[PDB]
């Protein structure tokens, strides 16, 4: 198989410096050019970079020029992308890909998160219910940084009818998420609904049982 | 800095959640107005061979 | 950083994705497949050279060209264009169509008045098409700035949208006034459907 | 981009802007109308400017602060904007007037610049409310996408309608290949989606 | 009166300069500070740099912060805007304003900057062929910078007449469309002719538009 | 630093007046002439240099 596993992402500041590594597994990169692209939450790809190493060539983005660094290590089969000078329009996942002759593999992505907040765990609060026909439920996934947070019901008991929005960055500088579930409100008296939180970045690991008013 | 732990047992929350600080003391006001917002409260009761602090009703 | 382009077609229907470079690319044109979140799939290289794996139904100046000869349920994704120095179109993400179906609105007290903020929720669940317009009032006075929304990903089991609107104001405001509402407007809603609380268990 | 509302003459609508710090009391609000230079309304959070009318209020209450407008008047739909902390402006609202529901008009028009290597094709929408619309293309019922650019009007100053102007745009050779190119659109306001159709070359 | 006009705006290639000026007017800029304030097409409004120029204070967003400077000349009353290493992030409309000594009291009229490869382009004029009501335009394409301008019959007709925004194409030159609603019993007897301005590559045309 | 060319239009349908720089009036011809070929304006075409302004009449 040809895999490329990346890492170096994660937090740091406005005009602060992170390196990303793609160690490449199956081939050796010297028959092989490995590109570097990026995407926002919800927006469309961008191309950043791209090296050749059998040839030397380096190619970055024109919005990258004099702050990123593409590098490739033989000896270790893994090309870097050393970010510097970073502000916040870079706030993307970051893919390590490579190239009579197209991107044909893709690496797993990483995150990349530039901001002054610090890492922060989420805040949990129920969103509670109203016999009878239907009811809804949830719980709100408040002031947590940097993303992502992963939200279960009853450890997966629970999936049908279940909608775990995507995060929205707030003018705090913290995410918020909800995640609810339609449920027959005939339930609500007996049935127990929990609320599974996952945060690794902060590794916090909670659950909220929501109960009616 | 180094990294505490609260480690929170009650009625609908449940789990463990961390934060950096100076001191113990600091990551204890942090931890603190955590529980408050949740409406937890309970027996505090601090570890510091593990830097985790412990909330249960 | 910019939204991809829509398009809606039901299954069968024939489809041709359009990629403009500025100048003469030659042959180096690709084409990739993507589905929410995860990485993108090659399909074409060099404009019309198919890629192992994908099905027979896939074909492809300064016009370059992505043709779905039949589509299916498993094509529902964004696609993409490449320009061999290299820049990434657009982008275009293919929506499944189906019946309108309007919204079921719930409104949610806000449970985190010890945070010093209070966050109001108006939950839409499960309407057809995308466009959904919430707007928020309080005291009958509507009201902006204060909110934020998000939306899901089209459902794979009966294509369905959803949507999230938080109101979130300081303890002080919210506690100055009695009636939360958010009115919904959608297609399939013959009126404006509000949903309501008054503060204080009223 | 601006965010949107609907408001009908007498409604009552009050802007928020929040900054992530402490902006004191230094929030100034302005208003913007199309082609105009902006305007501004409100300074220091509550102070008005002179010659502001009498429905302008700007607040504070908490580091929330707010401008509100007591009884929307005819004059007012425009884009309001505010500005906090590095001074630093909200991503401004545009307050559009409530009205009927109306259907468009779809004209569609072959191409005429043959001659000059790309063929364009322009299907109109005119005069309907509300602003979202629906078009999409098809060649030999195809439906196509990517070819095509949208542009909108402003809201009109009488009759509060919007219209559509979309442009198919294709290489002559690509062009000269199909037979059949149509626009059909999708309104509220439409009971059955409209399509509207041409046979190339006078058939 | 207090006015302030704007100048200097116009083209200029990826890494070109432009510098742009806002001469004061009704008052002294010592009195004041100054700010410059821009504007993408349809997009919102961004603070960019400001200078109070009896303190000597800068003050530069971070998306401007070391490639523009911002001067004052004092026996001029003029401000002025170096921006450099110009690239399409900065394409918008420029706004000189003042705040006298909170808040910005007066504005500018703004002024045009447009950063890209292509060179000027006079526009092209292309009828759209009318057939109850009839509808007919021309369509004003490839046509570099902004703006152009339509009018029909010079003015003479308002009523039915849409002018709609540019857009932008994969050449990288604009096109927009104006149109006209009119009865089509006039199409036999008046004349529908589309005016066409665009000063930036001194082009004034007017085209004739009669059915297919 | 190049030079100026103008075209004055002068037919049945299109009447104006266009511009654009350029080497040579010979490029400033090519650029008139397809400029006309595309609008569909065939004439008799009058150049004059003390003012660097072609003339196409219909």
């Known amino acids: 198989?040809?895999?490329?596993?990346?890492?170096?992402?994660?937090?740091?500041?406005?005009?602060?410096?992170?390196?990303?590594?793609?160690?490449?597994?199956?081939?050796?990169?010297?028959?092989?050019?490995?590109?570097?692209?990026?995407?926002?939450?919800?927006?469309?790809?961008?191309?950043?970079?791209?090296?050749?190493?059998?040839?030397?060539?380096?190619?970055?983005?024109?919005?990258?020029?004099?702050?990123?660094?593409?590098?490739?290590?033989?000896?270790?089969?893994?090309?870097?992308?050393?970010?510097?000078?970073?502000?916040?329009?870079?706030?993307?996942?970051?893919?390590?890909?490579?190239?009579?002759?197209?991107?044909?593999?893709?690496?797993?992505?990483?995150?990349?998160?530039?901001?002054?907040?610090?890492?922060?765990?989420?805040?949990?609060?129920?969103?509670?219910?109203?016999?009878?026909?239907?009811?809804?439920?949830?719980?709100?996934?408040?002031?947590?940084?940097?993303?992502?947070?992963?939200?279960?019901?009853?450890?997966?008991?629970?999936?049908?009818?279940?909608?775990?929005?995507?995060?929205?960055?707030?003018?705090?500088?913290?995410?918020?998420?909800?995640?609810?579930?339609?449920?027959?409100?005939?339930?609500?008296?007996?049935?127990?609904?929990?609320?599974?939180?996952?945060?690794?970045?902060?590794?916090?690991?909670?659950?909220?049982?929501?109960?009616?008013? | 800095v180094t990294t505490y732990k609260l480690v929170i047992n009650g009625r609908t929350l449940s789990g463990y959640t961390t934060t950096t600080a100076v001191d113990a003391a600091t990551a204890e006001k942090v931890f603190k107005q955590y529980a408050y917002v949740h409406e937890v409260d309970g027996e505090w009761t601090y570890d510091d061979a593990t830097k985790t602090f412990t909330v249960t009703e | 950083t910019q939204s991809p382009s829509s398009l809606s077609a039901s299954v069968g229907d024939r489809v041709t994705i359009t990629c403009?470079?500025?100048?003469?690319?030659?042959?180096?044109?690709?084409?990739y497949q993507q589905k929410p979140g995860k990485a993108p799939k090659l399909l074409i290289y060099s404009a019309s050279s198919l890629y192992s794996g994908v099905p027979s139904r896939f074909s492809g100046g300064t016009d370059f060209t992505l043709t779905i000869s039949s589509l299916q349920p498993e094509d529902f994704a964004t696609?993409?264009?490449?320009?061999?120095?290299?820049?990434?179109?657009?982008g275009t993400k293919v929506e499944i169509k189906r019946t309108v179906a309007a919204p079921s609105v719930f409104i949610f007290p806000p449970s985190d008045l010890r945070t010093g903020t209070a966050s109001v929720v108006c939950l839409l669940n499960n309407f057809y098409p995308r466009e959904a317009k919430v707007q928020w009032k309080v005291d009958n006075a509507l009201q902006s700035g204060n909110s934020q929304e998000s939306v899901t990903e089209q459902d794979s089991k009966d294509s369905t949208y959803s949507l999230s609107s938080t109101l979130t104001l300081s303890k002080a405001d919210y506690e100055k006034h009695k009636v939360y509402a958010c009115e919904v407007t959608h297609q399939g809603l013959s009126s404006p459907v509000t949903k309501s609380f008054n503060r204080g268990e009223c | 981009s601006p965010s949107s509302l609907s408001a009908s003459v007498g409604d009552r609508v009050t802007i928020t802007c929040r900054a992530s710090?402490?902006?004191?009391?230094?929030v100034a609000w302005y208003q913007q109308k199309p082609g105009k230079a902006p305007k501004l309304l409100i300074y220091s959070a509550s102070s008005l400017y002179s010659g502001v009318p009498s429905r302008f209020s700007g607040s504070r209450s908490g580091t929330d602060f707010t401008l509100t407008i007591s009884s929307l008047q005819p004059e007012d739909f425009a884009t309001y904007y505010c500005?906090?902390?590095?001074?630093?402006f909200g991503q401004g609202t545009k307050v559009e007037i409530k009205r009927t529901v109306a259907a468009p008009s779809v004209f569609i028009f072959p191409p005429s610049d043959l001659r000059t290597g790309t063929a364009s094709v322009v299907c109109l929408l005119n005069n309907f409310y509300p602003r979202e619309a629906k078009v999409q293309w098809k060649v030999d019922n195809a439906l196509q996408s990517g070819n095509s650019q949208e542009s909108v009007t402003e809201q009109d100053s009488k009759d509060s309608t919007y219209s559509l102007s979309s442009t198919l745009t294709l290489s002559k050779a690509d062009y000269e290949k199909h037979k059949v190119y149509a626009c059909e659109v999708t309104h509220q306001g439409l009971s059955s989606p409209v399509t509207k159709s041409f046979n190339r070359g006078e058939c | 009166e207090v006015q302030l006009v704007e100048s200097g705006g116009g083209l200029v290639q990826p890494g070109g300069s432009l510098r742009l000026s806002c001469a004061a007017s009704?008052?002294?800029?010592?009195?004041?500070?100054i700010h410059w304030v821009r504007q993408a097409p349809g997009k919102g409004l961004e603070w960019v740099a400001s200078?109070?120029?009896?303190?000597?204070?800068?003050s530069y967003a971070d998306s401007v912060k070391g490639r523009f400077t911002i001067s004052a000349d004092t026996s001029k009353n003029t401000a002025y805007l170096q921006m450099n290493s110009l690239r399409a992030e900065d394409t918008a409309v420029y706004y000189c304003?003042?705040?006298?000594?909170?808040?910005?009291?007066?504005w500018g009229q703004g002024t045009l900057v447009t950063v890209s490869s292509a060179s000027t382009k006079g526009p092209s004029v292309f009828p759209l062929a009318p057939s109850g009501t009839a509808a007919l335009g021309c369509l004003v394409k490839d046509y570099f910078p902004e703006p152009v301008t339509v009018s029909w019959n010079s003015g003479a007709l308002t009523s039915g007449v849409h002018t709609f925004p540019a857009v932008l194409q994969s050449s990288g030159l604009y096109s927009l469309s104006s149109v006209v609603t009119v009865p089509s019993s006039s199409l036999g007897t008046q004349t529908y002719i589309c005016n066409v301005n665009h000063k930036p590559s001194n082009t004034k045309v007017d085209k004739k538009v009669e059915p297919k | 630093a190049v030079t100026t060319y103008k075209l004055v239009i002068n037919g049945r349908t299109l009447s104006g007046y266009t511009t654009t720089t350029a080497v040579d009036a010979a490029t400033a011809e090519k650029v008139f002439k397809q400029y006309a070929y595309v609008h569909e304006v065939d004439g008799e075409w009058t150049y004059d240099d003390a003012t660097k302004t072609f003339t196409v009449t219909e």
């Open positions: 009704g008052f002294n800029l010592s009195s004041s500070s």
């Open positions: 500005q906090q902390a590095l001074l630093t």
């Open positions: 710090q402490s902006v004191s009391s230094a």
């Open positions: 304003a003042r705040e006298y000594h909170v808040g910005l009291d007066y």
């Open positions: 200078i109070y120029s009896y303190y000597g204070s800068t």
